[PDB]
Structure 1
Amino acid sequence: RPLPENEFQRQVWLLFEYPESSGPARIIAIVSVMVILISIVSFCLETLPIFRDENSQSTIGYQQSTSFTDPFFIVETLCIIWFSFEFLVRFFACPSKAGFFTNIMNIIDIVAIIPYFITLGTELSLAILRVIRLVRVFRIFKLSRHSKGLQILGQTLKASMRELGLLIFFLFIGVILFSSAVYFAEADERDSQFPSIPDAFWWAVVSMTTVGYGDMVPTTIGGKIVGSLCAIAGVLTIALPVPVIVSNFNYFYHRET
């Protein structure tokens, strides 16, 4: 990547892009990491009943007001201010403005920055607000800028898209098969825990993944046989694409050194 060459844009770009270049760059990287971690902790703690009950305060998790009495709103505002400053500096110092919005890291930053401003504009349909609150957890992906392992995992996911799709397709086929089998095998009972095939989807996904929650369990002998087959076939189906994905991850992992 070429330097900005402006003699001041280049300095800011080096400061905010390559932490190893200088001491100030390293401290800026550490500050950004700590800010992201603080934002994640605040987002997770907003949902605790201690603050939720003893308080807008539940639809968004923070009270948007000029006074800004709520500590959660203060922390979120500070984190969003830091994120906005960082993104604006990077966008103003990016040598290629046309190609700036193509990198996945900048899209991640924009996704982590939008919901706060969307809520602020709205304050100036309820499921939309819940979805906006839910997508506020995507700032955990802002750590991919400072973590090399996260970048390796992202490259592995990009390269192993076909294997992931094959795993999903095989899982769906097995889930449909075993859900139908267990619904029809355990249908002539009043104590049946499978009311329909779409409900048996939960049992199929739980059994194939070897999770075994136990909330839904077959009772009839045919149900038990179907459950055995579901467990074995789920083990096999999961184990088929996983070695390919792991080989891709190892190739991208040891490529660094």
Structure 2
Amino acid sequence: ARVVAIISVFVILLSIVIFCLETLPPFFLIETLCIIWFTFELTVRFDVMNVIDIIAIIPYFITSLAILRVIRLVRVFRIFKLSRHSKGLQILGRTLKASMRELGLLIFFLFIGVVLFSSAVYFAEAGSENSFFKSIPDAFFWAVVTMTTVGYGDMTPVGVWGKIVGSLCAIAGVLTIALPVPVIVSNFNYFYHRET
């Protein structure tokens, strides 16, 4: 039995690897052995894990560009089959389930901040011929990268008033992201300690 679990993990990892390398600038035969093994255990077994196992097989049987792209993307959920053997991924899923309200609050704060600062910078830079934001929707990406401190890149065209708005945006984003993270971190620490 322990040898089979090693075999199953090896097959899952091989499927993940071949899934990545088939996109590089045979594969189907190896994938076929993976899909037979995937469905072979499914019938013997026959929860979220079972649903993921179903999704891991649907794109194979099915095979309008949007539909094909969607099914090709949904094929990536092979990597989530590792949750059966891995423990950290199970812990991460449990914490994500148990911290839904804080995630919603974080998204709401980010949304309020992004619309506020996008309007502010758009109006502050609307009085110049060369505008770095065509519209309020065009500035959501800039605001979300600045508030996350990932960094937009170049702020050269931005004028003096725009620079003041951007400095305020940086400080406010630092604060508003430092706000709702510790609760999620504490939940993860709780679950990890309980598991270990």
TM-score, normalized by the shorter chain, greater than 0.5: yes
Higher RCO (C-alpha 8 Å, min separation 6)? 2
Alignment partner, residue 240 of structure 1:
179
Report matched runs for 1:45-84 at 5 Å: 45-49=21-25, 71-84=26-39
Deviation at 1:188, TM superposition (A): 2.6
Deviation at 1:217, TM superposition (A): 6.3
* Residues 94-122 of structure 1, C-alpha deviations (whole Å, 9 max, x = no match): xxxxxxxxx11111111111111112xxx
* Residues 201-256 of structure 1, C-alpha deviations (whole Å, 9 max, x = no match): 11011111111131676611111111112112222222111100011111111012
| Between 81-90 and 149-158, the greater mean CA deviation after superposition | 81-90
SS in structure 2 at match of 1:255? helix
Alignment partner, residue 111 of structure 1:
55
Pairing 1:42–2:5 present: no
- Show structure 1 runs of 5+ residues with no match: 1-24, 50-70, 92-102, 120-124
Does structure 2 conserve the Cα–Cα contact (< 8 Å) formed by 1:163 and 1:241? Answer: yes
> TM-score, normalization: structure 1?
0.72
Pairing 1:153–2:129 present: no
SS in structure 1 at match of 2:151? coil
Alignment partner, residue 209 of structure 1:
148
Cα 1:218/1:31, change in 2 over 3 Å: farther
Cα 1:128/1:26, change in 2 over 3 Å: same
* Residues 35-76 of structure 1, C-alpha deviations (whole Å, 9 max, x = no match): 111111111112211xxxxxxxxxxxxxxxxxxxxx222222
> TM-score, normalization: structure 2?
0.94
Q: Residues of 1 paired with 2:18 and 2:78: CA distance?
A: 12
Alignment partner, residue 227 of structure 1:
166
Q: Residues of 2 paired with 1:185 and 1:77: CA distance?
A: 58
Higher-helix-fraction structure: 2
Letter in structure 2 aligned against 1:40:
I
- Show structure 2 runs of 5+ residues with no match: none
Q: Percent identity?
A: 85
Letter in structure 2 aligned against 1:77:
T
Does structure 2 conserve the Cα–Cα contact (< 8 Å) formed by 1:193 and 1:217? Answer: no
Report matched runs for 1:103-142 at 5 Å: 103-119=47-63, 125-142=64-81
Give the structure with higher Rg (CA): 1
Deviation at 1:181, TM superposition (A): 1.0
